[PDB]
């Protein structure tokens, strides 16, 4: 009866935009209900065969911008990779789009926080949303990345 299983830390960010951790086959019938056009994938690892077959069967485009895992206090969020992902995210032709890496907290959290900065949200509101997903794994380096992210080159879009 209660048969749909959203992926780990699943949320709707905006019209046509979702965030989560890594979907597995248990999550595919739920993802099918969203009519996705795109996945923005932020892990460096190759997409598993299971997931590739799901994308092929559903006509979903895979955009990969691989960000290596880092531990505090040595967090290094690659600005270029976040900005390449943001360029894809802001094109409505890619929507509906699911953003994911592993847990839906860090790489995912940074990309969504930078979108919120472009949407003119105050930093405390951006940080509150970031912290809601990251919970006990909230990182000051992820919020610092958002604090200094220069929105100049995206301001026109």
Curated annotation (Swiss-Prot):
Citing just one GO molecular function, the answer is: inositol-5-diphosphate-1,2,3,4,6-pentakisphosphate diphosphatase activity
Q: Does the keyword Metal-binding apply?
A: no
**EC number, as in UniProt:** 3.6.1.52
Disulfides per UniProt: none
Q: Which organism is it from?
A: Arabidopsis thaliana
Q: What is this protein called?
A: Inositol diphosphatase DSP1
Enumerate the residues binding 1D-myo-inositol hexakisphosphate.
76-77, 80-81
Active-site positions on this chain: 101 (phosphocysteine intermediate)
Recorded consequence of changing residue 68 to A: Reduces phosphatase activity toward para-nitrophenyl phosphate 2-fold
Per UniProt, which keywords does this protein have?
Hydrolase
Tissue localization of expression: Highly expressed in siliques and at lower levels in roots, leaves and flowers.
**Where in the full protein does the shown chain start and end, and how long is the full protein?**
50 to 206 of 215
Describe the family membership recorded for this protein in Swiss-Prot or TrEMBL: Belongs to the protein-tyrosine phosphatase family. Atypical dual-specificity phosphatase Siw14-like subfamily.
Activity regulation per the record? Inhibited by manganese, calcium and zinc ions but not magnesium ions.
For the Tyrosine-protein phosphatase domain, which residue ranges apply? Answer: 9-157
Please spell out the taxonomic lineage of the organism that makes this protein.
Answer: Eukaryota, Viridiplantae, Streptophyta, Embryophyta, Tracheophyta
- What does this protein do, in the record's words? Cleaves the beta-phosphate at the 5-position of soluble inositol pyrophosphates. Has highest activity on 5-diphosphoinositol 1,2,3,4,6-pentakisphosphate (5-InsP(7)), 1,5-bis-diphosphoinositol 2,3,4,6-tetrakisphosphate (1,5-InsP(8)) and 3,5-InsP(8), but has weak activity against 1-diphosphoinositol 2,3,4,5,6-pentakisphosphate (1-InsP(7)). Dephosphorylates the phosphoinositides PI(3,4,5)P3, PI(3,5)P2, but not PI(3)P, PI(3,4)P2 or PI(4,5)P2. Possesses phosphotyrosine phosphatase activity in vitro, and can hydrolyze para-nitrophenyl phosphate, O-methylfluorescein phosphate, polyphosphate and ATP.
